[PDB]
């Protein structure tokens, strides 16, 4: 007939909140992502399925990808601190074209350069030579200068370490939990009818790319399409493949590495003498495999938009070299690949390999920071990296052309969207164990 | 008949101790960082405490001392990422100025030209810049050199930060508290009749000065005198008054800003060209308001001495110009003003603008840290500075025989008195919530 | 059976795990900043009876953590100091002949170079004095520093000092340190008399390679410790029962002038010496050394056959960093050719000796090709009085039939100096929870 409130401590109630994450890695010499001062990951996957739960997951609002954009650059600056500096290298280069079994496409690409720099002591000098690419060497008024000389001074970044993406696990702190949505047909934003809690997430490889997803997690049964608004003109509509398609990117030059001393304990590594016939770096994609893979997303794109509507693919529109080319990593050396040969497509209703020219840069700006640059050291030997491409970063164009001839082009001016396809299942939530309820209590007085 | 013990939890008990504080800002770049400072709570509860007394103690508490160490440390953290300004110590060929020069700036501003390296290290360019007379020293048109290069040369302040004083708050840490006083007559010591408890303080100005306190906390009704030992001559006297007299410190030289690039990503912000007529910077103070302020301070100094003595106001004694003259900050500049006209009066027993010259030194130095310094970049336009003078620092002359003709003269060679008067109510104190008292308890055993 | 579980709060249960430590000082010194809690006036030594606790040596975590601590203590000590990169300059670098003796001919070098002034547009010809073990030939010849083809480094700031201040490594809350008090405590084995101590006694972190200085001596007899007394590839640790004084000095009244290396920051060069210059030497009495050499060989008859010929020889060789003595007398690092201290043999049954000691100023001494240091000069003469207490030896075996069982003083590494100082302690973790059968039943209200 009457109710009295009682205290319940330790009941399952969670409220949305934000926090920092942890580090976790397995099987241990030096790494830029997972240093030696990191706790090892758990040996058992605590995945607890839940029932009678419907939670509204909201990507593009969680700050885990913003937290990802916070600690990677913190790790990226930290490895650069105890490194040899390359500020005296933009003294005026006297360069010339190299012609030693040269092809037509590499004519004017590589430059045999020579300049004057210090020895171990600071009173003797030597006339040393090195090799440089066209994309980082510009004119002055035969005298050439580095592209980074009118910008911030910058370093070589310690070739004893590697940029190999080792999968890292973000583990939740004590008192919190991470919810994983196991729904197979869950798109960007909306309720999740089957969510499972987990203490710490699965392996996430911190790879960086601007156009295509590399080495990502595959889909379950059907390729998914996620966007801010299905009618939006921007904000990087993206897809995720369900089947993996492989790519081989090779550098067929017999490149060698020589040690040239900046000064006392200041060892700098420069490109030596190439051996044999030089060939352009190229990436091969199977023509039949890529065409049928593109033949599956075109069916998935026809239900969000109108039926019996033709769509035409196109290459990049414009911008700098970091957005119009497929930029990624291959064994510690950066690639900038032309992508017109994979994105010339026109599809109509009622329905051996492709080569890609690719240019190589040595000094790049990894992010939009203006305060630093990294001189990729020339790494020896022929390199052959195998990888799977599993996603696209597309940008549509406007114009009310009767909802016909829609244009899709690979963009991706923002580079933190790479981790959105890896952290889409997960969200950070705060556990509140205290609760109240009315009962018949009448606490007696002793 | 006997008594039994008790434990009390949460009782009001204070014992004196010391504790580091933490920042609290209103969340409004700044050299007083404020980007990572904790936002303040917009409700200080002014809990009045009745039937209470508290013995405060100025010049012994470390509340001013703990914040004093944070003044240097906050500027050091904002100076390390700034660009180094060492390599301009090449010899300076210097000339004089032109374009309708007046008698007051006759030989103070100097036109200097010197060699300088460029972005290409083996190429140099000749540049010109304007420097003051207190920026170069003579090497025996003649060759001048920087004053602060035979001493430890330093950097320049970044253009993004600003030296405007944000009134910051120091909330008490958890488990700790501070108390404020609300009396009328106040020594450096004395039991406070009305003590109030608050966690987060009001606005505290971190502005620095040596001669005249400006932008300080106003008084209540009348002029109170603070001194460690009023009979001693080596103790600094802190005087604050209720009516804020205004100063209009102007820089009537309209100047531009020129960027001289000294290296890769390193730009030295040189002075441009003085366009228009040139005039010496000065500060304006009202004649009538300043004299009655001196008329409102003569009464309360006579209550601490005899009524037959005659007080004489003179200027500073002598020494370095940085300690014997006025010094403050107005929009990134550092004014050195001659205060002879402010302290030239005699007081017998019972249109209106006072002007005073001001000098400009671009190179400013730390008062205690001679190991480094900072170079204030020039600011384009006309610098307008309006401020309230709230406090003065006076020093009594040595000797003063026969207890008559007691002259009061300026001084104050320390920088800790600028905030000692701004924390006059406050003293950190430690609470302990435990207590034992006798009673008639007999706990029932089970 | 009427048995029910209960729990106990505050039970001594010992588990072994790695543990971070504290700091304590005995009331600038950046080498041991001691910005820590002061030690208690009266430590709490509590002897524990009826307990046999196993202690293990050479795998203890106390020596490994503090080895990383002094490296981190060193790196913080040198980052607020001036860089000496403007010294890889061609040195018109020559002899010195005034007031020299026979064996010092060529060791000291009057050596000059070019260096800048306040203006970075005018140079000057300054001069300094450098030792032979600091410069290397290139071809009044041309010379360069040793560290010019390796990592550039700084100099130690002159105000701070590197003298050994005793410090205490104390366990945190929920943690304990067990001190064994056995007079004949073998390193590998259980200690039948284990006592507990909150914070240990003073520890002097001296950096020595050949011998051990200012260590904790034994009580009544010298002791020998070894991981594998059959193996000949491990260092032999010997801890003395009595201290032997050593007298090392530099007889040069060396001045010290400071030149301006650049913008205000300075480089403290070596000034011109006053008077005649002799060789630095260390003094050890024969009466207190031959008898204690008979003590250490007496304990060698309890681990091997007593009918064995024992010989003492010189070092094996290698670089100068490990074949000679190295210590920290007054901020000056001497290098002593210890040959008369290890030249003896024993049959199967006043008199101070001088030691040739050379002076070096660029010392690496952490097996690091990443940083080094320039030692500043010290005004006046150098004077130290110390006790030697440890002999890091090496069994030069290979031979058989228990014949000519020689020992060569080695000490290639540097963590074995501290293995004889932290020898009494082992970290334990207390578990204040536990269960036991009890006839008790919990009542229900």
């Amino acid at each position, epitope marked *: 007939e009457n109710l009295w409130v009682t205290v319940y401590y330790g009941v399952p109630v969670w409220k949305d909140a934000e926090t920092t994450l942890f580090c976790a890695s397995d099987a241990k010499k030096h790494n830029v992502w997972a240093t030696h001062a990191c706790v090892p990951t758990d040996p058992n996957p605590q995945e607890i399925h839940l029932e009678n739960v419907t939670e509204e997951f909201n990507m593009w609002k969680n700050n885990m990808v913003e937290q990802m954009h916070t600690d990677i650059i913190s790790l990226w600056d930290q490895s650069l601190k105890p490194c040899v500096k390359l500020t005296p290298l933009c003294v005026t280069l*006297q360069c010339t074209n190299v012609t030693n079994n040269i092809t037509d496409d590499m004519r004017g690409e590589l430059k045999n350069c020579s300049f004057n720099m210090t020895t171990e002591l*600071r009173d003797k000098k030597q006339k040393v030579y090195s090799l440089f690419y066209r994309l980082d060497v510009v004119q002055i008024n035969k005298e050439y200068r580095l592209i980074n000389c009118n910008t911030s001074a910058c370093t070589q970044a310690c070739p004893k370490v590697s940029f190999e993406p080792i999968p890292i696990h973000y583990c939740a702190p004590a008192g919190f939990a991470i919810l994983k949505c196991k729904d197979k047909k869950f798109n960007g934003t909306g309720p999740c009818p089957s969510v499972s809690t987990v203490q710490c997430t699965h392996g996430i490889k911190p790879v960086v790319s601007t156009q295509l997803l590399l080495n990502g997690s595959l889909a379950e049964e059907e390729v998914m399409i996620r966007s801010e608004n299905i009618t939006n003109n921007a904000k990087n509509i993206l897809v995720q493949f369900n089947t993996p398609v492989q790519i081989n990117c090779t550098r067929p030059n017999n490149n060698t590495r020589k040690s040239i001393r900046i000064g006392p304990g200041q060892a700098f590594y420069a490109t030596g003498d190439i051996i044999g016939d030089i060939r352009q770096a190229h990436c091969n994609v199977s023509k039949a495999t890529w065409n049928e893979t593109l033949g599956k997303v075109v069916k998935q794109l026809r239900k969000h938009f109108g039926n019996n509507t033709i769509i035409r693919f196109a290459n990049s529109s414009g911008g700098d070299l970091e957005v119009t080319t497929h930029s990624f990593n291959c064994g510690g050396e950066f690639f900038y690949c032309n992508t017109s040969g994979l994105f010339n497509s026109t599809w109509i209703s009622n329905t051996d390999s492709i080569t890609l020219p690719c240019r190589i840069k040595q000094i790049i700006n990894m992010w939009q920071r203006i305060g630093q640059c990294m001189y990729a050291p020339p790494i020896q030997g022929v390199i052959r990296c195998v990888s799977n491409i599993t996603g696209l970063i597309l940008t549509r164009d406007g114009g009310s052309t009767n909802s016909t001839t829609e244009t899709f082009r690979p963009g991706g001016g923002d580079m933190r969207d790479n981790w959105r396809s890896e952290l889409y299942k997960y969200k950070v939530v705060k556990i509140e164990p205290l609760g109240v309820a009315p009962t018949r209590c009448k606490r007696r007085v002793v | 008949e006997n008594l039994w013990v008790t434990v009390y939890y949460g009782v009001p008990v204070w014992k004196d101790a010391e504790t580091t504080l933490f920042c609290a800002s209103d969340a409004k770049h700044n050299v007083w960082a404020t980007h990572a400072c904790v936002p303040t709570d917009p409700n200080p509860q002014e809990i009045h405490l009745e039937n209470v007394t508290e013995e405060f103690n100025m010049w012994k508490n470390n509340m001013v001392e703990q914040m004093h160490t944070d003044i240097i440390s906050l500027w050091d953290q904002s100076l390390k990422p700034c660009v180094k300004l060492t*390599p301009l110590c090449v010899t300076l060929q210097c000339t004089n100025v032109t374009n309708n020069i007046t008698d007051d700036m006759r030989g103070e501003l100097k036109n200097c030209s010197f060699n300088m*390296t460029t972005e290409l290290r083996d190429k140099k360019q000749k540049v010109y810049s304007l420097f003051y007379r207190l920026d170069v020293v003579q090497i025996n048109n003649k060759e001048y050199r920087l004053i602060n290069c035979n001493t430890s040369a330093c950097t320049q302040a970044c253009p993004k930060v600003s030296f405007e004083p944000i009134p910051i708050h120091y909330c008490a840490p958890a488990g700790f508290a501070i108390l404020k006083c609300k009396d009328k007559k106040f020594n450096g010591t004395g039991p406070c009749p009305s003590v109030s408890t608050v966690q987060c303080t009001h606005g505290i100005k971190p502005v620095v000065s040596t001669q005249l306190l400006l932008n300080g906390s106003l008084a209540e009704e009348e002029v109170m005198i603070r001194s460690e030992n009023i009979t001693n001559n080596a103790k600094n006297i802190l005087v604050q008054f209720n009516t804020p007299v205004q100063i209009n410190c102007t820089r009537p030289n309209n100047n531009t800003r020129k960027s001289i690039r000294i*290296g890769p990503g390193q730009a030295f912000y040189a002075t441009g060209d003085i366009i228009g007529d040139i005039r010496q910077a000065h500060c304006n103070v009202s004649k009538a308001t300043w004299n009655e302020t001196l008329g409102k301070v003569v009464k309360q100094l006579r209550k601490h001495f005899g009524n037959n003595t005659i007080i004489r106001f003179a200027n500073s004694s002598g020494g370095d110009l940085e300690v014997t003259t006025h010094s403050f900050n107005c929009g990134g500049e550092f004014f050195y003003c001659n205060t002879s006209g402010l302290f030239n009066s005699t007081w017998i027993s019972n249109n209106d603008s006072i002007t005073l010259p001001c000098r400009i030194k671009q190179i400013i130095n730390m008062w205690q840290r001679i190991g480094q310094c900072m170079y204030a970049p020039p600011i384009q336009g006309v610098i307008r500075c309006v401020s309230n003078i709230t406090g003065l620092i006076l020093t009594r002359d040595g000797g003063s025989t026969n207890s008559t003709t007691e002259t009061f003269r300026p001084g104050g060679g320390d920088m800790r008195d600028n905030w000692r008067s701004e924390l006059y109510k406050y003293k950190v104190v430690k609470i302990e919530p435990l207590g034992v008292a006798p009673t008639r308890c007999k706990r029932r055993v089970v | 059976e009427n048995l029910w579980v209960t729990v106990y709060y505050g039970v001594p249960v010992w588990k072994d795990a790695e543990t971070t430590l504290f700091c304590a000082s005995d009331a600038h010194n950046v080498w041991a900043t001691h910005a820590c809690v002061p030690t208690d006036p009266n430590p709490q030594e509590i002897h524990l009876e009826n307990v046999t606790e196993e202690f293990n040596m050479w795998k203890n975590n106390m020596v490994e953590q503090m080895h990383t601590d002094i490296i981190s203590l060193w790196d913080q000590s040198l980052k607020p100091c001036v860089k000496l*990169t403007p010294l890889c300059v061609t040195l018109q670098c020559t002899n010195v002949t005034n007031n020299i003796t026979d064996d010092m001919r060529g060791e000291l070098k009057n050596c000059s170079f070019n260096m800048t002034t306040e203006l970075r547009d005018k*140079k000057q010809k300054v001069y300094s004095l450098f030792y032979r073990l600091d410069v290397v030939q290139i071809n009044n010849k041309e010379y360069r520093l040793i560290n010019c083809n390796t990592s550039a480094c700084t100099q130690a700031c002159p105000k701070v000092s590197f003298e050994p201040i005793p410090i205490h490594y104390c366990a945190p809350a929920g943690f304990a340190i067990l001190k064994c008090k056995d007079k004949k405590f073998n390193g590998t084995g259980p200690c039948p008399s284990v006592s507990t101590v909150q914070c240990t006694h003073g520890i002097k972190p001296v950096v020595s390679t050949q011998l051990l200085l200012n260590g904790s001596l034994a009580e009544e007899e010298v002791m020998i410790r070894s991981e594998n007394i059959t193996n000949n590839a491990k260092n032999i640790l010997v801890q003395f029962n009595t201290p032997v004084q050593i007298n090392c000095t530099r007889p040069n009244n060396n001045t010290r002038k400071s030149i301006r290396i650049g913008p205000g920051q300075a480089f403290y060069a070596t000034g011109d010496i006053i008077g005649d210059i002799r060789q630095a030497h260390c003094n050890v009495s024969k009466a207190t050394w031959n008898e204690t050499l008979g003590k250490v060989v007496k304990q060698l008859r309890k681990h091997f056959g007593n009918n064995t010929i024992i010989r003492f020889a010189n070092s094996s060789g290698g670089d100068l960093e490990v074949t000679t003595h190295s210590f920290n007398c007054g901020g000056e690092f001497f290098y002593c050719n210890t040959s008369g201290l290890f030249n003896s043999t024993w049959i199967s049954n006043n008199d101070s000796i001088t030691l040739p000691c050379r002076i070096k100023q660029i010392i690496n001494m952490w097996q690091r090709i990443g940083q080094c240091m320039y030692a500043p000069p010290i005004q006046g003469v150098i004077r130290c009085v110390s006790n030697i207490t440890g002999l890091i030896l090496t069994r030069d075996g290979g031979s058989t039939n228990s014949t000519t069982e020689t020992f060569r003083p080695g000490g290639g590494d540097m963590r074995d100096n501290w293995r004889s100082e932290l020898y009494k302690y082992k970290v334990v973790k207390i578990e204040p929870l536990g269960v036991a059968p009890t006839r008790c039943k919990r009542r229900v209200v």
Partner: antibody
Framework: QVQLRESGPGLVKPSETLVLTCAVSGGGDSFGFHYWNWIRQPPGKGLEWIGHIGGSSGSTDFNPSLKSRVTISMDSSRNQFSLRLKSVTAADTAVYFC????????????????????????WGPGTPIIISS | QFVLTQPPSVSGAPGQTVTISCTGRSSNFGGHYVQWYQQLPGTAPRLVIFENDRRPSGVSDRFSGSQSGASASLTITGLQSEDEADYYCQCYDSSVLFGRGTRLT
């Protein structure tokens, strides 16, 4: 060890072009930095200057009182530079020397250091030139 | 083209110090860094004092120069019988300036 050698004939006809080649030995890569100059001296009087020649790039700076009268060549392959003066008269009877313009290298992280004057550290034995029939 | 002022003959005796000065015109101070040379009878000229006051390592310590404003000086203390040779004053205004020469008797 660098020696500035000399060449050239003896008796020579006036009013035509005379050749002088100076060779440096200990260089290898020590030719591009330092300038090279020709200095001549009449007997009994002071020194006179001729002109410059480039180290690696090649620059021709000459004395203002000997313009359109002397040309200097350079190879940068054998470290040999030739001196060719024309319209030689009987008043040009002098001994000719080839000298090395010194250089004081120094580079710090902040910037580079440059020299001030035209000082000659290395000289040659020289060869006298006589103008007769 | 303007030769520098220089005394053709100066007396030299062992045990004393001589001073040689050279100065042309100094309306605009461009000849800041005067250079000195020493040429034994015939043979090869040498460089004794370089950028105003500095010297190469290998010459005698008694050689010392001075730059007193617009006037330059060279002082040798304790003359002997081997340094009695010719000396030249080298300046720079447009390209290269050479002095006349001296003679230590």
């Amino acid at each position: 060890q660098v020696q500035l050698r000399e060449s050239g004939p003896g008796l020579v006809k006036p009013s035509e072009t005379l050749v002088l080649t100076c060779a440096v030995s200990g260089g290898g890569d020590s030719f591009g930095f330092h300038y090279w100059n020709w200095i001549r001296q009449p007997p009994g009087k002071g020194l006179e200057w001729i002109g410059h020649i480039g180290g690696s790039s090649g620059s021709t700076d000459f004395n203002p009182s000997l313009k359109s009268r002397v040309t200097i060549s350079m190879d940068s392959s054998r470290n040999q530079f030739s001196l060719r003066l024309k319209s030689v008269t009987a008043a040009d009877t002098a001994v000719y020397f080839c000298a090395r313009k010194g250089e004081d290298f120094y580079e710090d992280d902040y910037g580079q250091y440059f020299t001030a004057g035209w000082f000659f550290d290395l000289w040659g034995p020289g060869t006298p030139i006589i103008i007769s029939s | 083209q303007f030769v520098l002022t220089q005394p053709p003959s100066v007396s030299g005796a062992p045990g004393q110090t001589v001073t040689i000065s050279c100065t042309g015109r100094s309306s605009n101070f461009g000849g800041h860094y005067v250079q000195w040379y020493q040429q034994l009878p015939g043979t090869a000229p040498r460089l004794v004092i370089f950028e105003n006051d500095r010297r190469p390592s290998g010459v005698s310590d008694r050689f010392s120069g001075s730059q007193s404003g617009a006037s330059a000086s060279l002082t040798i203390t304790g003359l002997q019988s081997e340094d009695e040779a010719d000396y030249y004053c080298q300046c720079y205004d447009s390209s290269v300036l050479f002095g006349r020469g001296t003679r230590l008797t």
